[PDB]
Design a protein around this ligand. Structure first.
Ligand SMILES: COC[C@H]1O[C@@H](O[C@H]2[C@@H](O)[C@@H](NC(C)=O)[C@H](O[C@H]3[C@H](O)[C@H]4N=C(N(C)C)O[C@H]4[C@@H]3CO)O[C@@H]2CO)[C@H](NC(C)=O)[C@H](O)[C@@H]1O
Length: 377
């Protein structure tokens, strides 16, 4: 199995114990590390933070401590939108300009591949032709990577993609069988499945449906989403299950109505470290639990929740990560990806469960505890 972990270049700005840099990553924890995010300018890949080059160096330098570790650079993200992707795929000349720039960039900065995070082809402003043009882009990149590998006599750069979990988004976004042929891995974003936008409490990454999930709501779980991708043409072995080390929080409309599907009035408070409205990092959730919140367990969905006063959070813990890991193995998927390494309790000081408790749970369950960890020759 793969254990693929995303690092974010804005974690560096968090106060005190929240500050997370590339050198805070245990090089032995994950099989793959992915750097979020690169941007785009004039159809070429670019940095987005002032110190990205320094951070790339520290990030890829982790490979000097683990000979088997591979790194990728993710381009895009939710906030990036679609406009630059649409313009880039719109002409073969623009795609060539992009692919050329990517080969140069990855080789220059010592990344082992590119993770596409276009959210998403065919939606959020992206026109219908982008569904097919995305397949074309990925194929051209894969083939360019194959050709480059042989011309310079080095291992081939990887091409992967982070992909939608929403059924409507998948249908308008991806030619699954064709896309699957050229991607090395498919990073399925099986989280953000519920949020305050719905006006009631719901889980971030439930494994199964809740009894009340009717109609299209029955699609809002990890099991349905992974199987949808599989049944519609993606090989299980290339499919990578999404694991969140954060939760979504809510303001309860009634403080003593605290179950799944309880009325909410909006997003819950930003955390004191990550400072993200409606989102708490796992370690931020541990503070909530320490401060007296009542622990809940969503039995049908195999995930925890917690509440105190008018604040409710749906999230994942060691227990739920373990349950999902076992399910993943039973279903013979390629492994797990984690958003994000910097949101796990990396210091170990918040949750008292050891350093990186959530990702460590996956490392153990996926048979990677004895994985080789030695500097390269
Ligand atoms: C809100 O202020 C903090 C900080 O936000 C940065 O934006 C990022 C956050 O909103 C991320 N959310 C969480 C819960 O971490 C968000 O994460 C998305 C990501 O875009 C998607 N891509 C993937 N994978 C697997 C490739 O997974 C998804 C995750 C989880 O939903 O990402 C946005 C950025 O897209 C700000 N940064 C940028 C670059 O906009 C900024 O640093 C801000 O201060």
């Amino acid at each position: 199995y793969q254990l693929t972990c995303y690092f974010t270049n804005w974690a560096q700005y968090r106060p005190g114990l929240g500050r997370f840099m590339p050198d805070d990553i245990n090089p032995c924890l994950c099989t793959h590390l992915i750097y979020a995010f690169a941007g785009m300018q004039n159809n070429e890949i670019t940095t987005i933070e002032w110190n990205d080059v320094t951070l790339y160096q520290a990030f890829n330098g982790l490979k000097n401590k683990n000979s088997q570790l591979k790194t990728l650079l993710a381009i895009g993200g939710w906030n990036f939108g679609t406009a630059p992707f649409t313009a880039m795929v719109s002409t073969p000349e623009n795609r060539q300009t992009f692919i050329t720039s990517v080969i140069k960039f990855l080789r220059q900065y010592e990344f082992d591949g590119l993770d596409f995070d276009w959210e998403y082809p065919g939606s959020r402003g992206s026109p219908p032709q982008d569904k097919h043009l995305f397949t074309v882009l990925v194929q051209e990149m894969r083939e360019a990577f194959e050709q480059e590998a042989k011309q310079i006599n080095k291992p081939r750069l990887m091409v992967t993609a982070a992909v939608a979990a929403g059924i409507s988004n998948i249908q308008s976004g991806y030619e699954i069988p064709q896309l699957s042929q050229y991607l090395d891995y498919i990073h399925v974003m099986t989280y953000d499945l519920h949020g305050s936008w719905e006006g009631y409490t719901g889980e971030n990454s439930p494994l199964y449906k809740y009894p009340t999930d009717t109609g299209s709501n029955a699609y809002l779980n990890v099991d349905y989403v992974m199987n949808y991708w599989k049944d519609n043409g993606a090989p299980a072995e290339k499919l990578i299950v999404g694991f969140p080390t954060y939760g979504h929080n809510f303001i309860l409309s009634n403080p003593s109505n605290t179950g799944i599907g309880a009325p909410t009035s909006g997003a819950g408070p930003a955390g004191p470290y990550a400072k993200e409205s409606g989102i708490w990092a796992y370690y931020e959730i541990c503070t909530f639990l320490k401060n007296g919140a009542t622990q809940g367990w969503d039995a049908p969905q195999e995930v925890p929740y917690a509440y105190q006063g008018n604040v409710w959070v749906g999230y994942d813990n060691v227990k739920s990560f373990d349950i999902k890991a076992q399910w993943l193995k039973h279903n013979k998927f390629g492994g797990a990806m984690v958003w994000a390494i910097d949101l796990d309790d990396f210091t170990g000081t918040f949750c008292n469960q050891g350093k990186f408790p959530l990702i460590s749970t996956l490392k153990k369950a996926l048979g990677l505890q004895s994985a080789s960890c030695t500097a390269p020759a």
